[PDB]
Write a protein that binds this ligand. Sequence first.
Ligand code: HEM
Ligand code: CAM
Ligand code: K
Length: 405
Amino acid sequence: NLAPLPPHVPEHLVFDFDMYNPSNLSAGVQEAWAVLQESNVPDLVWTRCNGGHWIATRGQLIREAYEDYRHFSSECPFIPREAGEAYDFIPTSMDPPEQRQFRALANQVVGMPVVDKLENRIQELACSLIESLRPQGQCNFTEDYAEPFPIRIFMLLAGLPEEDIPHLKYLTDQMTRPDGSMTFAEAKEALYDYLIPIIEQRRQKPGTDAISIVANGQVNGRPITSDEAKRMCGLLLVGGLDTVVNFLSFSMEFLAKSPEHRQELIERPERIPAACEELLRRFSLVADGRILTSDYEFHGVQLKKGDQILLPQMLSGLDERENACPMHVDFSRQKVSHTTFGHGSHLXLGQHLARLQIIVTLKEWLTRIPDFSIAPGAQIQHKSGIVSGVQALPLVWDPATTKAV
Ligand code: HEM
Ligand SMILES: CC1(C)[C@@H]2CC[C@@]1(C)C(=O)C2
Ligand SMILES: [K+]
């Protein structure tokens, strides 16, 4: 239900948006969140859902809050409070000064030099999967590509067996879009239960994989601890298993529904990177937040120490104050403004990997299957959370229109 309204919150600021089951979900997730930017809604609102918390609804406030880590701490970055309290991943649960030293280590395993080394295998995997689907004239895109394409690459990078994917994917999903079977704390402890023996093993006998690299790594010139390594490796798993996996499906749902936009990319494939950026804006999908370190008056609103504030990364690029006609996809948009990969000191460090995976998927798919549609009669369902997603995406095409390459 709705948590009782705290005394310090004026009733005129109440807007009971449920980030885990938003009212207008049937219209699309981004559409469902964009209700927070309707004409009657203030820049900063209180929702009584999910224990009660603030929501910044506009790009300007979201950006300002991500910059001000002194007032807006990452210590408790998830809603609901019990999830944010249990959340201890590194670097995300940390503020400067201590946070930054951990970013360099994470960059060693998923940063640009690593992405370069993996790029041929990434390309190869996309081609392999797509060629196998091509003659079928149909797929369940979420499970036939959106999942295995990013996840098998992450498993390879981390040196984990592919048979472990269903278990790990289940756990990650419970931390971002819980189905009610597990609390965040339970899913976290299970993920750590998995990692503990692996980290011990790889500190004793290091390999070349990501976990070995992190577990035996150094931070600001001193050895990382087993526990710090566990808390970082957990985060890396969530990133590899539950980000681009969802994003690809939003993109592909859009392309199937939009023949005019596909054709643009078939006629002019060099536009694909710009298209990637515009889609990252339009189908932005992350929303986490921060906790107030002290009482603070922010844009005329009295925020109280300990208050949680959702700062939906998703909303910045959908904000008409940041981009004209924001629900329209324009691959030639001149200034594509978004905070899809975050803002401030916690900027996504997986973004080279993410962009490569998106760009590769678009290029390799459109080359082989230029003409495809949503299965006739299908209604695409979505699920909202910390990272939002597509429940299923049945696609169809005429094999005669495809090219084996
Ligand atoms: C479309 C794909 C992705 C999106 C939209 C995305 C989004 C984000 C966002 C919004 C943040 C900031 C969180 C915050 O400020 O609290 C973040 C941080 C982070 N992301 Fe990504 N991400 C994506 C892919 C990836 C991938 C593939 C990885 C690979 C491991 C990854 C690893 C990380 C890490 C390690 C951080 C923490 C940085 C820090 O706290 O200093 N992300 N990401
Ligand atoms: C918000 C994120 C996308 C970012 C990387 C994975 C994620 C769910 C986190 O816990 C930090
Ligand atoms: K915490």
